[PDB]
Scaffold this active site. Structure first.
Site, PDB file in Angstrom:
ATOM      1  N   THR A 159       0.799  -1.217   0.000  1.00  0.00           N
ATOM      2  CA  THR A 159       0.000   0.000   0.000  1.00  0.00           C
ATOM      3  C   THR A 159       0.845   1.287   0.000  1.00  0.00           C
ATOM      4  OG1 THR A 159      -2.029  -1.050   0.718  1.00  0.00           O
ATOM      5  CG2 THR A 159      -1.762   1.270   1.292  1.00  0.00           C
ATOM      6  N   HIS A 420      -1.176  -9.397  -0.558  1.00  0.00           N
ATOM      7  CA  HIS A 420      -0.567  -8.768  -1.727  1.00  0.00           C
ATOM      8  C   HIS A 420       0.877  -8.389  -1.369  1.00  0.00           C
ATOM      9  CE1 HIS A 420      -1.155  -4.914   0.427  1.00  0.00           C
ATOM     10  NE2 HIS A 420      -2.351  -5.390   0.729  1.00  0.00           N
TER      11      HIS A 420
HETATM   12 ZN   LIG Z   1      -3.571  -4.774   2.311  1.00  0.00          ZN
END
Ligand SMILES: [Zn+2]
Ligand SMILES: *[C@@H]1O[C@H](CO)[C@@H](O[C@@H]2O[C@H](CO)[C@@H](O[C@@H]3O[C@H](CO[C@H]4O[C@H](CO)[C@@H](O)[C@H](O[C@H]5O[C@H](CO)[C@@H](O)[C@H](O)[C@@H]5O[C@H]5O[C@H](CO)[C@@H](O)[C@H](O)[C@@H]5O)[C@@H]4O)[C@@H](O)[C@H](O[C@H]4O[C@H](CO)[C@@H](O)[C@H](O)[C@@H]4O[C@H]4O[C@H](CO)[C@@H](O)[C@H](O)[C@@H]4O)[C@@H]3O)[C@H](O)[C@H]2NC(C)=O)[C@H](O)[C@H]1NC(C)=O
Ligand SMILES: CCOC(=O)c1cc(-c2cccc(Br)c2)[nH]n1
Ligand SMILES: [Br-]
Ligand SMILES: [Ca+2]
Ligand SMILES: [Cl-]
Ligand SMILES: [K+]
Ligand code: NA
Length: 805
Positions: A159, A420
């Site tokens: 992120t 991720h």
């Molecule tokens: Zn995340």
């Protein structure tokens, strides 16, 4: 300390943040525990909900409500987003047919179209198709505006690295946010997702869009939202700022959603619990567009809908444990999860050794779900090495898996079904882009592009000059109706020499031999014209590349290929040749197996020599134009010229030979001919830029022949494959690679097998953009084509990914 004792009356969501220990009323105040006593009461009103109902229409203004349905609300700019629909018989934005926005249709006083950036954490690219039934607003944006089928994030697909890349156009290695979690050895400090230190300005390099905006006199609305501020309040705030006087009103705005990432982690990318978050995001978009429509701003504003990364299926049982590989597990520190980063637990222990750790993590189990690397050996396309925050040892983890230190870490922390952070070529990591508004094109699909490119476009949308960045400005000109940026080709810095025959054979004392002394008018004017450049148009299809630095080099012509030969590095900078669909592979004849021939155009003093290679027990040599693809027995001689020779480790020769003997022909068959430009790369300091000669750490033993760190190839043909590469009318098709020049094949676990089982997979791992090769060489390719420069810029940023659909 904050004296939290002042008030937020008439200060709710103030645009300039104020200085401690005075109390704050800005959309970030909660994150610092610094709001005034009355912030909640005055600024986070919730009474009566987020929507008008029939009976609320024309009501008395009650200042306590979250939003208003009274008559005055429009001029006050604080109605509920559905006010006109419920109380004045208007339709929702999503129920209107779409109409081309040819020009900004703005209120008087607006100097430029505002830009709203609507960003969504963990919005996987396939959600656009797969969730299209439950997302009518997002789907109207997508099909009416401009869209990509996906956008490539940066590595690592986390992120903070990706949001800050969007904001700056910079690779994480240059902007500094190299993970969600970091240790800076110079600072002796750590950066964490939870806590205080992440706020310190010294972590955050480059120049983010909001600072670029401010410096150039464009007002920015405070980009960032405290997590507890509900989404409905964020939209109402943005809509209120839009109602401010011309002199106070921001021109750029940001909305961020924690969904669908938050849910994806718990339920997996396609959990049936994932439909509800997608519906709520769409409802939010619906609220924004309805609110813009109310203010007559829905045909004036440019909207960007953009994701940071996708989401993959990951569970606890799919963890690899370094404790199953290492006996010394307690002396190391691991940054864990979807990537691995290893350093010494204590700098006071000199019995730590990275070489032994890498070796113990190399090809140890038949199905191993990570691969260790020295960071400088990672694929160049990741651009993940030139920062003191990035540990020397890296683990690239397979999609769907995790790495942890000991099993205790996993169960003294099954909770998650999604994560991720993997390699940015991976399909499940791809995210989204939609542009909608007067500056964007109408009903246009554009190809996949990388998120590093957006900063430039958002500057364009705002009339700003971008800070120096890693985008290629102009490469996204095709998304835009206007405000295009019209760049020029960089000027050539060095012109080439064109040497003729200047040296006699006996002047060369190189220790080289060749079985070649074998003796006509028809065929002698012939080979001279070949050396003068008579087939150059065949082998140099896009012009000669430009040299963009100060150096001394020669152009060399031959029947089958053309090179730019560097008198400084004693090898070509580039070699260019064309292989047609019809061309035939031959072998290297026996008499010529160890043939190296002097080049009578280049001085002995500017040539490599064979003796050095004989003395160097580690280093052998190969050729840039492959002898295998000679157009005739007589032309084959040119391929053995010392000026076509480059230094190669025996282990890399296995790679190089298979590429040259088997794959070039294969691609010529599949693509209707190919053009090939090959060459060496030197990047000893792993910064992604061309090394100067004083940067080279290795030479072939006892000579000034410098050793490349990598070898590149750029393979070009016609996009319409019904036309042969040499006679192409339209757009071009490209794929390239940057292969690391390694003394072993430890990277490929099945390298003791036949080259046809591992070489092509290795090349795919090291796929590259032409633009990557440009940075690493200081050359500029595609100088003379029939195509527009913007279109060439796009081609130069293309990456061939080898993932299925
Ligand atoms: Zn995340
Ligand atoms: C992607 O795009 C980016 C952006 O364009 C490209 O990066 C640029 O590359 C340039 C060339 O490497 C580089 O130019 C140098 O500037 C030096 C001054 O640096 C400061 O100025 C800028 C502008 O304000 C600023 O952004 C920098 O911020 C960095 O540093 C701090 C950390 O300290 C971070 O907060 C920030 O994140 C950023 O870090 C990143 O960049 C640095 C490189 O500067 C890396 O080391 C980090 O790992 C990290 O990735 C700076 O505050 C200037 O001093 C340089 O000049 C030296 O070298 C030249 C050669 O021309 C020589 O003339 C001089 O003598 C000088 O050397 C002297 O110092 C040496 C070391 O002490 C010593 O060896 C000598 O003997 C000398 O005394 C140089 O001109 C520019 O900074 C960056 N910009 C950014 C933002 O990264 C990047 O190349 C692109 N990537 C690709 C693949 O294309
Ligand atoms: C960490 C929580 O993030 C936020 O609240 C936020 C992020 C952005 C943003 C992100 C990337 C590029 C741009 Br330009 C803006 N705007 N608001
Ligand atoms: Br950010
Ligand atoms: Ca370099
Ligand atoms: Cl991380
Ligand atoms: K040797
Ligand atoms: Na191997």
């Amino acid at each position: 300390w904050t004296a939290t004792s002042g008030s937020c009356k008439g200060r709710c969501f103030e645009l300039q943040e104020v200085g401690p220990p005075d109390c704050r009323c800005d959309n970030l105040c909660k994150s610092y525990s610094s709001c005034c006593h009355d912030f909640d009461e005055l600024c986070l009103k919730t009474a009566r909900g987020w929507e008008c109902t029939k009976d609320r229409c024309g009501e008395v203004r009650n200042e306590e409500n979250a939003c208003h349905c009274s008559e005055d609300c429009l001029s006050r700019g604080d109605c509920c987003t559905n006010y006109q629909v419920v109380c004045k018989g208007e339709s929702h934005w999503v129920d209107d047919d779409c109409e081309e926005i040819k020009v900004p249709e703005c209120p008087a006083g607006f100097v430029r179209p505002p830009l709203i950036i609507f960003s969504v954490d963990g919005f996987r690219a396939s959600y656009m198709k797969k969730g299209s039934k439950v997302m009518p607003n997002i789907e109207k944006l997508r099909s009416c505006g401009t869209h990509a089928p996906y956008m490539r994030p940066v590595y690592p697909t986390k992120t903070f690295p990706n949001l800050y890349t969007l904001a700056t156009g910079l690779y994480p290695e240059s902007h500094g946010i190299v993970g969600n979690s970091m240790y800076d050895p110079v600072f002796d400090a750590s950066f964490h997702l939870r806590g205080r230190e992440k706020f310190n300005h010294r972590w955050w390099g480059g120049q983010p869009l909001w600072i670029t905006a401010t410096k150039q006199g464009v007002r920015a609305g405070t980009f960032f939202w405290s997590v507890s501020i509900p989404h409905e309040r964020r939209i109402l705030t943005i809509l209120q700022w839009l109602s401010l006087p011309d002199n106070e009103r921001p021109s750029v705005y940001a909305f961020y959603s924690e969904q669908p990432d938050f849910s994806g982690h718990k339920y997996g990318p396609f959990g049936p619990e994932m439909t509800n978050p997608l519906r709520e995001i769409d409802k939010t978009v619906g609220q924004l567009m309805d609110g813009l429509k109310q203010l007559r701003l829905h045909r004036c504003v440019n909207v960007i809908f953009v994701g940071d990364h996708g989401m993959e299926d990951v569970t606890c049982d799919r963890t690899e444990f370094l404790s199953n590989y290492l006996t010394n597990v307690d002396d190391i520190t691991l940054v864990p999860g979807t990537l691995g980063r290893i350093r010494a637990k204590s700098i006071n222990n000199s019995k730590y050794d990275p070489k032994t750790i890498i070796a113990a993590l190399t090809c140890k189990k038949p199905d191993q779900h990570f691969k260790p690397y020295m960071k400088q050996h990672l694929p160049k396309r990741l651009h993940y090495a030139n920062n003191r925050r990035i540990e020397d040892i890296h683990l690239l983890v397979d999609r769907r898996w995790h790495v942890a230190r000991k099993p205790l870490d996993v169960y003294k922390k099954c909770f998650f079904q999604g994560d991720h952070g993997f390699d940015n070529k991976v399909n499940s990591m791809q995210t989204v882009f939609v542009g909608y508004g007067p500056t964007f094109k109408y009903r246009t699909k554009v190809p996949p592009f990388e998120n590093i490119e957006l900063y430039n476009v958002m500057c364009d949308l705002l009339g700003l000059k971008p800070a120096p960045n890693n985008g290629t400005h102009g490469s996204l000109n095709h998304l835009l109706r206007t405000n295009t940026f019209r760049p020029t080709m960089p000027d050539e810095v060095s012109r080439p020499n064109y040497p003729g025959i200047m040296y006699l054979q006996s002047e060369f004392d190189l220790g080289c031999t060749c079985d070649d002394k074998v003796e006509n008018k028809l065929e002698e004017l012939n080979k001279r014209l070949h050396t003068k450049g008579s087939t150059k148009e065949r082998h140099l299809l896009y012009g000669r590349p430009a040299v963009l630095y100060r150096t001394s080099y020669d152009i060399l012509y031959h029947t089958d290929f053309e090179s730019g030969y560097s008198e400084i590095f004693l090898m070509p900078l580039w070699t260019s040749y064309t292989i047609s669909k019809q061309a035939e592979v031959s072998s290297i004849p026996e008499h010529l197996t160890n043939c190296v021939r002097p080049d009578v155009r280049v001085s002995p003093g500017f040539s490599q020599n064979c003796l050095a290679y004989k003395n160097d027990k580690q280093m052998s040599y190969g050729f840039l134009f492959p002898p295998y693809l000679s157009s005739s027995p007589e032309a084959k001689y040119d391929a053995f010229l010392v000026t076509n020779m480059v230094p190669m480790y025996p282990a890399f020769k296995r790679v190089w030979a298979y590429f040259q003997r088997v794959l070039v022909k294969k691609y010529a068959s599949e693509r209707n001919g190919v053009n090939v430009i090959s060459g060496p790369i030197f990047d000893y300091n792993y910064d992604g830029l061309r090394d100067t000669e004083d940067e080279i750490k290795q030479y072939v033993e006892g000579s000034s022949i410098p050793v490349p760190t990598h070898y590149y190839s750029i393979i070009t043909s016609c996009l319409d494959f019904t036309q042969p590469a040499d006679k192409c009318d339209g757009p071009l098709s490209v794929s390239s690679f940057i292969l690391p020049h390694r003394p072993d094949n430890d990277e490929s676990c099945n390298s003791s097998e036949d080259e046809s089982k591992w070489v092509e997979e290795l090349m795919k791992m090291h796929t590259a953009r032409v633009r990557d090769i440009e940075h690493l060489t200081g050359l500029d390719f595609y100088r003379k084509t029939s195509r527009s420069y913007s279109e060439i810029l796009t081609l130069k940023t293309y990456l061939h990914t080898y993932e299925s659909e």
